[PDB]
Paper text:
[name], an RBR-type E3 ligase and the catalytic subunit of the linear ubiquitin chain assembly complex (LUBAC), plays crucial roles in various cellular processes, including the NF-κB signaling pathway. Particularly, [name] can directly phosphorylate [name] and inhibit its E3 activity, thereby attenuating the LUBAC-mediated activation of the NF-κB signaling pathway. As a serine/threonine kinase, [name] specifically recognizes and phosphorylates dozens of protein substrates, including Mob1A/Mob1B, Lats1/Lats2, histone H2B, FOXO3 and [name], thereby regulating their relevant cellular functions. In this study, using biochemical, mass spectrometry and structural approaches, we systemically characterize the association of [name] with [name], and unveil that [name] can directly bind to the [name]-[name] module of [name] through its kinase domain.
Therefore, we only mixed [name] (residues 854–1072) and [name] KD in a 1:1 molar ratio, and conducted relevant crystal screening using this protein mixture. Fortunately, this approach successfully yielded good crystals that diffracted to a 2.8 Å resolution. In the final crystal structure, each asymmetric unit contains one [name] KD dimer and two [name] [name]-[name] molecules, forming a symmetrical butterfly-like hetero-tetramer. Intriguingly, within the [name] [name]-[name]/[name] KD complex, the two [name] KD monomers, each adopting a canonical KD-fold consisting of an N-lobe and C-lobe (but lacking an ATP molecule due to the K59R mutation), directly pack with each other to form a symmetrical dimer through their N-lobes. In parallel, the [name] and [name] modules of each [name] [name]-[name] pack together to form a unique architecture that is mainly composed of six α-helices and six β-strands, and coordinates four zinc ions. Specifically, through its [name] region together with the β5 and β6 strands within the [name] domain, [name] [name]-[name] specifically binds to the C-lobe of [name] KD. Detailed structure analyses uncovered that the binding interface between [name] [name]-[name] and [name] KD is primarily formed by residues from the α7-helix of [name] KD, which accommodates [name] residues located in the α1-helix and β2-strand of [name] [name], as well as the β5- and β6-strands of [name] [name] through both hydrophobic and polar interactions. Specifically, the side chains of S877, Q974 and D983 of [name] form hydrogen bonds with the side chains of [name] T238 and R231, and the backbone amide group of [name] H228, respectively. Moreover, an Arg-Glu pair (Arg231STK4-Glu983HOIP) of salt bridge further strengthens the [name] [name]-[name]/[name] KD interaction.
Author numbering:
A (entry chain B): 10 to 173, 186 to 311
B (entry chain C): 857 to 1071
Write the structure that this text describes.
Amino acid sequence: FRRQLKKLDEDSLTKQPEEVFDVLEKLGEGSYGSVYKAIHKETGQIVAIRQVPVESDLQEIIKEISIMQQCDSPHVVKYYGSYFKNTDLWIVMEYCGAGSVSDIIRLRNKTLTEDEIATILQSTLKGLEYLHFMRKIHRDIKAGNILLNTEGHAKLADFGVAGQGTPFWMAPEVIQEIGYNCVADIWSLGITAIEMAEGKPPYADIHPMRAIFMIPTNPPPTFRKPELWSDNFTDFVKQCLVKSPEQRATATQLLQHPFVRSAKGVSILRDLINEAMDVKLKRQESQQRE
Amino acid sequence: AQGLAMYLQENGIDCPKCKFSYALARGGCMHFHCTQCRHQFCSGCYNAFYAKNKCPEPNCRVKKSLHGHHPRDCLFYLRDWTALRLQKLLQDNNVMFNTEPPAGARAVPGGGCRVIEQKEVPNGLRDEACGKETPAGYAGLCQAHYKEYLVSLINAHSLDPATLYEVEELETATERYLHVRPQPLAGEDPPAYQARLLQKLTEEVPLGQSIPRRR
Ligand SMILES: [Zn+2]
Ligand SMILES: [Zn+2]
Ligand SMILES: [Zn+2]
Ligand SMILES: [Zn+2]
């Protein structure tokens, strides 16, 4: 029985197998890797275990891990450890119950309101302020890379890895490959702000091989129907979307912008987070045969 | 991608009235309405498309309906030339061109022409690959876009198509750009007449001064 297991219980913490966590559900079978919810038995805390079965560039993953390890801030998804089980590598990291902002919009089939955007963007700007202060660049700012925990706090995840894809969020100086700095995230932030308000980035309906040429040499984008938005919102988007990087506003300056500075508390996101996670629960009841 | 289709779209179409870039090849209508500033223009020669009874140009025989004024070396005309004749103008002025795809291009064996085109779909615009047949010797492009590739080379080096014009072409060209009855002279001859007509047109009617030629 467990009499055999109890004899085996005379083992140290080093001897402990990967039973340290209890896998519960497959939250999303993402292409980067199957991602499972789990609970650490000893701490009772909920973590997310990203299985990396793919023989991807494990340097591309280790580079993502090493960037994650270098960050200690509640605005950035934390990393807890890794282990090998079966044939694949499993990566334990911070759990965000609601998911990415893109899925929140998708699940509710609903665009985010202004006040919801200002709260979500204020938290992310505090994250960008922390990273830029450390002379780091996220490099992949977008709605699908901004996770919300069950409480309602936005968190940056899935750092872009410096190469050696889709351009709609890229700054002009970064696609032209003329060299870029921290304020590159400010451009993608501005595009993300549009993506939150109207569901798609500007040039989304444009082919990538086309958009690569238009974005560097065209006026900074704006709202498709700019009569639907407040002056502070349009001005904030205008100040994020400045083609000259040296002229582009920094994350610190944007935090004092009227649109962000007056952002309401996390409590406003309460209703939409309940909406999104209810569509997730029903989505899991239909895939199971029973 | 990574083929001559990239070359076509790099230069693409830019509105002359407002400096707005579109990564769109030339084809189809070719009288282009700018979405940013509502300007009508020809995608080939960048001339204004004076549509109905508004043309300031003199001797407008075609003011009644949609028309535009195009130089002789605009794609608006050279699109009708054969692929072979265009290659002759290029060779006669010793300008190299592709007949095989560039080495980096790995054309999709099922796919055809990969030039990206905006096709009208319900409730918006959707970009799709051209996908027409890619003949051998056309450098991996379709017939329509391969000619356009050649015309860009001809426009790039400001080659004069009139160097290949026939007598009728010179008589057609003489009345269109010089507003005269081009009938021959008494005491003259058919060969000296061709060289005579060619000489004034080259000396008096310049090539398109607003065609995108990349400096
Ligand atoms: Zn225009
Ligand atoms: Zn023309
Ligand atoms: Zn006219
Ligand atoms: Zn084609």
